[PDB]
């Protein structure tokens, strides 16, 4: 029987690891500005994710080689005991890459380590990446409403702070628009709502924001909608364990 209500099994001994890569400043030649506000984001995620059962590990300002080393270690440890895996990146970005301290890294380089044929103990389990970074150089404008095998690529959920091609916004004290709203929605609904449903609420909250003050006068009024890309095959909940 095919079951339209089917959920991921989230009854393992451990919820799983949530890795946060937090980038505040960058090698001086990159000529990238400091990301004031990002420690708020990191601390906020740490609390929300711990409350959901995750074992949170944060790394601050790693160089590319050390970050890839770290993420490679995580992808080779057993997750046989875990429900799922979460990996968060807070940095600058463009196209399809983010920045480590000294160099950019293609997002696909990071996700590829968790594919089913490279990371067996996560086969069948949700693999969730959350990325706060710019995805391009368009600034979005406001408008007024008038047995079966599995594919190796299955079970990934990619949660972007913005749709491809656009600027993503950050407040210098409160943190990024997206992570603030994601955290509030996790806080209120994380242990009950289906996770995709939760992300759709995040889409609505962030799309209500507008740039109200800004060093650059032409940015006033501008906008942002997040985007999540799902290759999940079942419903995802974070009920208390």
């Amino acid at each position: 029987m095919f079951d339209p209500a089917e959920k991921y099994k989230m009854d393992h001994r451990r919820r799983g690891i949530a890795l946060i890569f937090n980038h505040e400043r960058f090698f001086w030649h990159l000529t990238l500005p400091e990301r004031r506000g990002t420690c708020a984001d990191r601390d906020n995620l740490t609390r929300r994710f711990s409350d959901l059962g995750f074992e949170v590990k944060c790394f601050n300002d790693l160089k590319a080689e050390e970050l890839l080393l770290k993420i490679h270690e995580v992808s080779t440890v057993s997750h046989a005991d875990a429900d799922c895996f979460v990996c968060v990146f807070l940095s600058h970005g463009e196209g399809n890459h983010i920045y480590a301290y000294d160099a950019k890294i293609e997002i696909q380089t990071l996700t590829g380590l968790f594919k089913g044929d490279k990371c067996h103990s996560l086969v069948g389990k949700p693999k969730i990446f959350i990325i706060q970074a710019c995805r391009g150089n368009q600034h979005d404008v406001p408008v007024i409403p008038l047995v079966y095998t599995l594919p190796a690529g299955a079970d990934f959920l990619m949660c972007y702070s913005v749709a491809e091609g656009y600027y993503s916004h950050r407040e210098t004290v409160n943190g990024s628009w997206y992570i603030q709203d994601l955290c509030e929605m996790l806080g209120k609904y994380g242990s009950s709502l289906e996770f995709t449903e939760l992300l759709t609420l995040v889409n609505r909250k962030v799309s209500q924001r507008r740039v109200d003050f800004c060093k650059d006068p032409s940015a006033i009024g501008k906008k942002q909608v997040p985007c999540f890309a799902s290759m999940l095959t079942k419903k995802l909940h974070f009920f208390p364990k």
């Binding site: 500005p33 990301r35 004031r36 506000g37 940095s91 600058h92 970005g93 706060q132 970074a133 710019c134 702070s161 600027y167 993503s168 916004h169 950050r170 407040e171 210098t172 990024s176 740039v211 109200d212 003050f213 800004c214 060093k215 940015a219």
Partner: peptide, 4 residues
């Protein structure tokens, strides 16, 4: 506001 700033940008990433």
């Amino acid at each position: 506001v700033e940008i990433x």
